[PDB]
Design a protein around this ligand. Structure first.
Ligand SMILES: NC(=O)c1ccc[n+]([C@@H]2O[C@H](COP(=O)([O-])OP(=O)(O)OC[C@H]3O[C@@H](n4cnc5c(N)ncnc54)[C@H](O)[C@@H]3O)[C@@H](O)[C@H]2O)c1
Ligand SMILES: NC(=O)c1ccc[n+]([C@@H]2O[C@H](COP(=O)([O-])OP(=O)(O)OC[C@H]3O[C@@H](n4cnc5c(N)ncnc54)[C@H](O)[C@@H]3O)[C@@H](O)[C@H]2O)c1
Ligand SMILES: NC(=O)c1ccc[n+]([C@@H]2O[C@H](COP(=O)([O-])OP(=O)(O)OC[C@H]3O[C@@H](n4cnc5c(N)ncnc54)[C@H](O)[C@@H]3O)[C@@H](O)[C@H]2O)c1
Ligand SMILES: NC(=O)c1ccc[n+]([C@@H]2O[C@H](COP(=O)([O-])OP(=O)(O)OC[C@H]3O[C@@H](n4cnc5c(N)ncnc54)[C@H](O)[C@@H]3O)[C@@H](O)[C@H]2O)c1
Lengths: 334, 336, 334, 336
């Protein structure tokens, strides 16, 4: 099996570990974080939104034992010091939020890992990959790769159908987002100077920036510059919805045509549903994006139309399932 | 003398309307009707989860409750036409039950003796739909049954009016991000109206749902009839809401700055303006019908083709209630 | 298989349905509520806290199809008008909350059902059963039985051990409960005139009465009149905790003896944990009561002691698993 | 003439302390220290999710920020000993960071040049722990570092005292059901202090946790040292909490009426009394250190053997803060 190390055993690190248990060909041999084994084992076993871990977890000498398998743990904040060469690490899943750039994540390679897959958008000379939208741009020789964001993974399959079938002129996005760990429990100073992420995450509708639409061109070059938008973070602990309002080249577009084109593009990353679901129904799903045909709207005034659509994602598990798909493909290629 | 008001439905809107009326001279709530008893009516006025403790003294007496010494008569009658409005010389009934959102049905109050009825919601039939400081001057005194429009309508109207007047509205789509309300279930359970989404645990979900606010904007602003549509996303905050509007405009080369300044230029007691990075809890209890947020203004340009996007905050409770009460005073002032 | 009808397809009724899916010898042939089949099917499929229905559901003619089997559905508020005679109903699971009385529940018997199991405490001379505490008091000649409350199923096995091993003098219970459907979404008149249940469920700590401790005599006669207490309903949508503070006859009681006696009494209804869990970790669990050893406390001043303990329960699934165990045992008899 | 206060840690307690001090004559906040900039400090003072908007004018100026024509200097210095307290003539530091909850560590402020330190939390080392209107009279003017106790301790002490004074306290156990606080994570994550329970999503769980409030009550009421213990359940409300106390007493044949009356007679500006069926949102912003709720009094009698339960509300924020600022003024007033 391909030997995987997880840097940052956080929400995405822990869910990625869970997901790897169920993909033949991949094995997590080491995790790194900023805490002790008592805490790491505990957070794997118990999960507020994603539920109890299936098998058994026991703290052992150099880390913890998950269903018979030993996993080594470390507490090394500076990634260049990690014993990656000695552990023969093939790929590092970079999930800390502190190495979101090609040169920063290069620290893992210096430590002896063959490749790095980052669990967020990242700056620098690197590929940004949404599985089943643009993973075929990987060739196996890449050393540092981005897995895009949760919002990008929800958006890209949708935007791609809109453009291929109808011709995208322009569009604006609003993502209605579960609150995340970069927000405060109570109003307090925010480390990044963000006066809105400073506010009590679970008591507020909180506007915030995102680059998912603005930077879509990294994933779909032919629509680069044609989208923008933002986020509204709201008090659900996981599960999100991307709403996209577009102008198209095709004229007299109907709801039926838009829904049908989306259904026709469905696969393991891109879901399709006509059920009147709500956000808790997407908790733990493995679709990168779940297109919801019940929310499609076409506004027509004379010859001029706006098309609006919406796709659900579990910002946690949807993204994680996409990340682990891209992980296996990157390993496959080499 | 003071305009004599009766509140039908001492719920969220009715109780807040009562509180707001204590702050406004010339209006007096003389009577309250609901489906409960005085112990409960008094308690719910005294204590309010989102809107805070009531400022005054509340005391249960025979026939109702005393508020700062002033007697309020209470009744527990579901059939509006049975109410003693003649004897109490009612001038306007604030209709906040959710069960009389129609011209003919609301006529029950007039039969019972009231002069006028103001309905706390959109309403069917041959009546005017009013957002204070957008189209309240369309009222001419002849009206006996009026709609105060919806919370979402009151947030949207002044925004849409500026967009159209200054830039020419071609078309647009709205999404409103809404506090959950009493027509939703606490736990996943069958829903009275067969709505499979309002059926779900209100404070645990992002819940899509319909709204007539954009579709029916033509009733408040005729010149844009049919040019807006949209929907809601109901989320787990107990009050406070945000309206996002994405539009196509006639004027070309529009900028963020131009839109913001135009919004600011139209500000008043109903239509507020802010450049502060506020969140939903900051508008709880505010008395603006709509609070434009200049920080959320965006412009997408691809060649000569633009989308323009704006957002205005509203406390679906106090924003709407403050507007409802301005319309009430105006509508009663026309009778004199 | 035993033919079951479910009256009230609500939180308990739907979860009992799910649970009944994995019990050979038990079959739901009919459901009754006050809504249409579309609503019923949808709420079976999708569940906010309990997750997606594991099988698959389809609306048909006079009810719905759940994995090959057909379930008849009705919309009859008056139970006496139900076709229980025609459908040969062996047991009605009474989950509406409107028939919590021996004589009231008799309507199902007149309608042609053989037995009624009520999913709550109920008045009149009938047996109140907590599975694995007193289900052997059933002899199979009973026509109407109560499955007790959620709190009673959490409290009974705890209380039994305390009395058996230490002798109960007297105690007070406080349960910290998930909010439930008898509460309002927003501050509003309450149907039962309760000025606390009238308040916004998910935005408050709400004190409220409970008859679980006061009526513990129905399940464990030897401690009748020895317990009382109340509830504090808080904003978690399911998952609850019972705390009990007692005076005991035995002297010099220690935390360790208490915990050891609980672990010794453990079974499939009464679990034991030394993990530092929180409420979301018991969501979906199948124990009626999970004793939490980390929460045991002993106060001593001279020879005088207060002993305190706590046990988790998913007021939803914990109760439901217990109700379905009682259903199967009750049905096995005549 | 004004006493010069510096607040170290402009957090939940630090900010509300600032607000409170605006009602106390002869007390002025001249300086604030934290880990951020004036943009952020000014914004968090203006807008408050649970306690509501600050009404005064706040603007960012060169040395810090200006509040209603009064200047406050701000710093961004994590090391208390490096603060310019001597230059600023600081009389008392209100230590609200959570990082100096120890006599010797808090000494850094004195070395920095502050005359006194009042810590907004329980604190280790050789110092007094003070609940205003329970034991503030213990202060004799020569204290250099003082603890203002915990929120729970302030809710508990006036209750424990009445019970002992009027009934003779044998022993008791406590559960406090608490609003979640900033020492908890928004989502399940490693916890900085290794606490596997505070590690969990604060707003989605009932979370058991320790509290020294009952166990360390002897520092406040010496005559009941060692007679109380208990813990906490942290639940998803953002502020507002309740202390439940179950006790055995020496006085026999005790009634709910005797207990409630004893509590009422003891009531003052620190210890409130209610017979209303309130919930947690009703105490948000209250200024009682403790609000006794007579509706929750219970007496369990089996033969001649009794258990007595009582319950007192507190806003863990404003109740505690109001108590801290009372102890602040009294401490400042000593030696004058
Ligand atoms: N949570 C989501 O919905 C989501 C979705 C998609 C992508 N992401 C991205 O994934 C990353 C992690 O997000 P998360 O929500 O899991 O955050 P998290 O805080 O839950 O996880 C971060 C973990 O990294 C650890 N860590 C921090 N610095 C470290 C260091 N220097 N060395 C080793 N460990 C360190 C922390 O202890 C923590 O356990 C971020 O880049 C985020 O943008 C998050
Ligand atoms: N809550 C909001 O944010 C909001 C905003 C704008 C408009 N509205 C509208 O105002 C109306 C009330 O909304 P709410 O949130 O206050 O609802 P609510 O449920 O809180 O209030 C309705 C009240 O009316 C009473 N009632 C019902 N039927 C009655 C009858 N037949 N006779 C007398 N009393 C009766 C109920 O007991 C309840 O107290 C609805 O039409 C709603 O659409 C609500
Ligand atoms: N929710 C819990 O944690 C819990 C736990 C233990 C016991 N219980 C008990 O179980 C019962 C149901 O509780 P719930 O939480 O599922 O409530 P619920 O409101 O979710 O379900 C009740 C269902 O019964 C239906 N109903 C009401 N009247 C009816 C009638 N006359 N005929 C047919 N159907 C009718 C309603 O439509 C609803 O779907 C109550 O007695 C309750 O006290 C609930
Ligand atoms: N919030 C409550 O309910 C409550 C009640 C009573 C007591 N307390 C106590 O008060 C203290 C603060 O609690 P809080 O809830 O306000 O926390 P908080 O996190 O909201 O505030 C702490 C503030 O101090 C700042 N800070 C941290 N280290 C600093 C440093 N070394 N120098 C300067 N500033 C620093 C932080 O940036 C933050 O703004 C804690 O000891 C807490 O236990 C809290």
């Amino acid at each position: 099996a391909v030997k995987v190390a997880i840097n940052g055993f956080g929400r995405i690190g822990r869910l990625a570990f869970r997901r790897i248990q169920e993909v033949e060909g991949l094995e997590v041999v080491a995790v790194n974080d900023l805490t002790d084994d008592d805490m790491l084992a505990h957070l794997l076993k118990y999960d507020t939104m994603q539920g109890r871990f299936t098998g058994e977890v026991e703290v052992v000498d150099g880390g913890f034992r998950v269903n018979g398998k030993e996993v080594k743990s470390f507490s090394e904040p500076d990634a260049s010091k990690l014993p990656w060469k000695d552990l023969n690490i093939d790929v590092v899943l970079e999930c800390t939020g502190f190495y979101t750039d090609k040169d920063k994540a290069q620290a893992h390679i210096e430590a002896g890992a063959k490749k790095v897959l980052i669990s967020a958008p990242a700056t620098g000379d690197l590929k940004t990959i949404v599985f089943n939208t643009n993973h075929q741009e990987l060739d196996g020789s890449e050393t540092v790769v981005s897995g895009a964001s949760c919002t990008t993974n929800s958006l890209a399959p949708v935007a791609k159908v809109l453009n291929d079938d109808f011709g995208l002129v322009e569009g604006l996005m609003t993502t209605i987002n579960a609150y995340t760990g970069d927000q405060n429990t109570q109003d307090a100073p925010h480390r990044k100077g963000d006066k809105r992420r400073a506010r009590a995450a679970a008591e507020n509708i909180i506007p915030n920036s995102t680059g998912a639409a603005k930077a879509i061109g990294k994933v779909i070059p032919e629509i680069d510059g044609k989208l923008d938008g933002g986020a509204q973070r709201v008090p659900v602990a996981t599960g999100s919805l991307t709403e996209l309002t577009v102008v198209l080249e095709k004229q007299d577009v109907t709801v039926e045509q838009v829904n049908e084109a989306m259904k026709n593009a469905s696969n393991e990353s891109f879901g399709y549903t006509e059920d009147e679901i709500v956000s808790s129904d997407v908790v733990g799903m493995t679709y990168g994006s779940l297109f919801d045909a019940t929310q499609t709207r076409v506004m027509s005034v004379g010859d001029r139309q706006l098309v609006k659509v919406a796709a659900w994602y579990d910002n946690e598990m949807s993204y994680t399932a996409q990340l682990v798909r891209t992980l296996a493909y990157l390993a496959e290629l080499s």
